[PDB]
């Protein structure tokens, strides 16, 4: 019997189905709303086929694929899209906001990603203004990924943002907010009970951004991930600014907290351990930074405070293999200590 | 004074220029033939500006950018391109070979990349046949990257190749050959003094492919990189097949040799050390595989045989930090021991 699975985020809107018939395992995959492709693999026996199918399924669900009724998946449509201006379109005089405002599938999308907006060094004012002036067309969005600009297009430290508080105000249904680039960025100081997830990717996170968060009310927030970055590109050097964020009173529903990509990553470990928010968390995110053995050490010296966590993300670190072995054996929950670097030590986005 | 630099390979055709005026460092970058973008960065003094510019330049040249006269770079055009069929084009009934044969810039390109050719599980027969039947239009190419199919499109083990010997025969000026995917692949057994570089990326490299190489004459070959892959996806399990390749008589002009992405990566180290080809090599490539400390050990026990090399690539390995430190301090030349994994151990393409 065919089992259908679906994966959906800002970038992927696809399905994957598997069926075992005899000694053949039949896979069908593609973008939602299309027939997709088909792969058939023969096995020595029905037993090997079923065993193979089992591993594929387990792998897919581990990656986030959700089993879905075939009749439902069949009728599902792409509900996420990225709008970006190419260099050619710019030369042609194409206006990104016009590409967005024009799209007839715009009403059907639940998530939207804003990518490169120009090549003349302009900030994203036209985009912010355009959205604010057309709130009715964007009032329905539930997810926004603002600034999906790759390294090749322009380094993160060159992304020119604007005050996005008016844009967020025009999207009252947003529950997932992701922003990349922090130069001149702001999100205001307003209550935003609509937000469930907030992640800001930065090459150096200004204090103004943190203050906007501290000044905002996010009672229903469940995930908060902030890239610290370095002083050369925006960070002001004072790590104590993040401390007030570690408060259950401030984020009573927070499950995932992350202060990442910092030179002083070990300090973040201390913040977690001494915070009153830690008991409620499921995930401690201390990735992308210069997390050393003295940082991991703290965790091991306080297993009591963290043994309830479901995941500790330390992806990209400077741990020694001996420490990683210890962490592996001494910590009961899932942890990611991958991408260890060779122990000047720099943050992940500094590469 | 503005200094202009250019980088060109199968995927990138771009320029980068830098100029220091006062305390400002002015960078201009983009695709060859376009005005590109401009970034200006102010510094505290002319000294800091020049120092900053120096680091940017050093970084660019280290990445392969070649300083070029401004008047020359200004007139340079993109000379590499990738032709690929999207799912939409297929639905529209578009034929990839027609997209290629149609392009009016085809005569001006020096390098060509063949990407996805269909979505019905077809092999690349139309492409091979199409080229063979239009040798005059492709007789000028100097570089060919056949099979640039990403993981998301379809896994490497699902790429369906064909006998490409006729395609290579239709491109007598080719000097750089790169092929990804090896199912039913062949390149024939003919003399090909035109080839300078040959790299085959595979999830399991069949003996038929190696035999084609052994059966061919490549006197002017300077680089040979072969991905071994695993038995589950094509490799036949016998590593001794590669041994005859390690011969100065066979490849008298070889400078870079690589047998990579193998489960028995340590054995490859032995092949190098015992070969008569090693003395002439500049680069020993033993990356992407399960290279362990006992493998690196051999190198350290025989510094005499390798101290002449300019580079030993061990990117993606299973070395311990202690061994990497030793290698770092005991080996006089540049080495890449990055992307170490945590010591079932698998090959890079097995992920």
């Amino acid at each position: 019997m065919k089992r259908v699975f679906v994966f959906q985020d800002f970038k992927s809107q696809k399905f994957w189905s598997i069926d075992v018939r005899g000694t053949d395992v039949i896979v069908n995959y593609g973008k939602l709303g299309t027939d997709g492709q088909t792969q058939v693999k023969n096995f020595s026996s029905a037993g090997e086929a079923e065993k193979a199918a089992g591993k594929l399924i387990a792998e897919k669900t581990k990656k986030g694929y959700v089993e879905t009724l075939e009749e439902v998946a069949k009728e599902m449509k792409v509900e996420a899209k990225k709008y970006a201006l190419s260099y050619d379109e710019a030369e042609e005089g194409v206006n990104l906001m016009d590409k967005i405002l024009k799209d007839k599938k715009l009403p059907s999308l639940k998530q939207i990603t804003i990518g490169c907006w120009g090549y003349e060094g302009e900030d994203c004012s036209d985009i912010a203004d355009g959205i604010v002036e057309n709130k009715e067309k964007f009032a329905h969005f539930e997810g926004l990924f603002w600034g999906d600009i790759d390294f090749e297009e322009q380094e993160i430290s060159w992304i020119e943002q604007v005050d996005l508080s008016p844009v967020l105000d025009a999207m009252p249904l947003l529950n997932n907010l992701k922003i990349k680039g922090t130069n001149n960025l702001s999100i205001g100081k307003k209550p935003r009970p609509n937000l469930k997830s907030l992640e800001i990717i930065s090459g150096g996170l200004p204090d103004s951004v943190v203050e906007d968060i501290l000044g905002s009310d996010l009672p229903n927030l469940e995930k908060l991930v902030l890239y610290v970055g370095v002083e050369d590109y925006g960070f002001d050097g004072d790590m104590n600014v993040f401390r007030p964020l570690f408060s259950k009173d401030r984020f009573p529903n927070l499950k995932w907290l992350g202060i990442v990509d910092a030179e002083e990553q070990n300090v973040v470990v201390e913040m977690f351990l001494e915070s009153d928010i830690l008991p409620q968390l499921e995930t401690m995110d201390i990735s992308a930074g210069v997390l050393t053995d003295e940082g991991a050490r703290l965790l091991l010296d306080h297993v009591d405070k963290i043994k309830h966590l479901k995941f500790i993300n330390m992806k990209y670190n400077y741990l020694s293999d001996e420490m990683k072995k210890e962490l592996q054996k001494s910590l009961p929950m899932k942890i990611d200590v991958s991408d260890s670097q060779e122990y000047p030590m720099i943050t992940e986005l500094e590469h």
Side-chain angles (χ1 to χ4, degrees), chain A residues 48-50 52-106:
Chain A
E48 294 301 323
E50 295 284 21
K55 299 195 70 176
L56 292 178
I57 288 175
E59 184 187 319
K60 289 293 165 192
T61 56
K62 189 182 75 173
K63 293 182 183 301
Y65 275 83
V66 182
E67 203 166 334
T68 311
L69 285 171
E70 205 184 329
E71 71 197 79
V72 169
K74 276 183 180 173
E75 299 305 306
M76 288 178 77
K77 303 287 169 50
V78 175
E79 65 177 18
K81 200 174 183 181
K82 177 177 180 173
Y83 296 89
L85 269 180
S86 63
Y87 188 92
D88 302 312
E89 292 176 300
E91 284 300 307
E92 190 188 307
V94 174
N95 172 294
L96 181 59
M97 267 286 117
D98 288 320
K99 276 224 291 182
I100 306 171
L101 292 170
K102 167 269 151 60
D103 203 343
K104 304 187 298 178
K105 66 162 63 184
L106 190 62

Side-chain angles (χ1 to χ4, degrees), chain A residues 32-50 52-250:
Chain A
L32 294 165
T34 69
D35 304 319
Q37 311 166 237
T38 294
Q39 303 180 313
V40 186
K41 191 156 60 280
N42 190 51
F43 289 81
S44 59
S45 65
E48 294 301 323
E50 295 284 21
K55 299 195 70 176
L56 292 178
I57 288 175
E59 184 187 319
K60 289 293 165 192
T61 56
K62 189 182 75 173
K63 293 182 183 301
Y65 275 83
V66 182
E67 203 166 334
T68 311
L69 285 171
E70 205 184 329
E71 71 197 79
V72 169
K74 276 183 180 173
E75 299 305 306
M76 288 178 77
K77 303 287 169 50
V78 175
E79 65 177 18
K81 200 174 183 181
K82 177 177 180 173
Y83 296 89
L85 269 180
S86 63
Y87 188 92
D88 302 312
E89 292 176 300
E91 284 300 307
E92 190 188 307
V94 174
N95 172 294
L96 181 59
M97 267 286 117
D98 288 320
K99 276 224 291 182
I100 306 171
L101 292 170
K102 167 269 151 60
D103 203 343
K104 304 187 298 178
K105 66 162 63 184
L106 190 62
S108 62
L109 298 179
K110 213 81 78 180
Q111 288 84 207
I112 183 167
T113 292
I114 306 305
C116 182
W117 39 81
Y119 296 88
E120 300 294 299
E122 323 88 334
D123 49 31
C124 50
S125 248
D126 277 44
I127 312 301
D129 286 41
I131 288 168
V132 173
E133 294 170 57
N134 294 287
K135 183 177 180 174
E136 77 285 347
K137 293 193 181 179
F138 301 84
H140 73 281
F141 285 102
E142 309 185 334
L144 170 62
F145 179 5
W146 188 283
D148 186 25
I149 316 304
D150 280 52
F151 193 76
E152 265 198 300
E153 298 178 287
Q154 112 187 144
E155 292 199 68
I156 197 166
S157 56
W158 294 90
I159 303 176
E160 297 310 310
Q161 304 289 31
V162 295
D163 172 26
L164 295 186
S165 183
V167 172
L168 301 180
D169 294 345
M171 298 189 213
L173 260 36
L174 278 187
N175 61 50
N176 186 172
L177 217 203
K178 183 173 177 179
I179 306 165
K180 178 175 176 172
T182 52
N183 290 175
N184 295 140
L185 167 65
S186 186
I187 59 172
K189 301 181 188 182
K190 302 169 175 174
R192 296 186 193 291
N194 58 121
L195 284 59
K196 298 239 202 67
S197 191
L198 173 59
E199 165 169 36
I200 302 178
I201 301 164
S202 185
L205 183 91
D207 277 346
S208 48
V209 176
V210 180
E211 294 186 70
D212 284 337
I213 302 169
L214 310 191
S216 303
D217 298 301
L218 309 174
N220 299 315
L221 194 67
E222 302 189 315
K223 175 166 178 172
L224 171 60
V225 171
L226 301 174
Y227 280 56
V228 181
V230 291
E231 289 188 52
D232 293 300
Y233 302 110
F235 185 51
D236 299 313
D238 174 37
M239 291 288 285
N240 287 312
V241 63
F242 300 115
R243 292 186 130 89
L245 293 163
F246 293 72
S247 163
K248 66 175 189 303
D249 291 314
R250 182 180 301 284

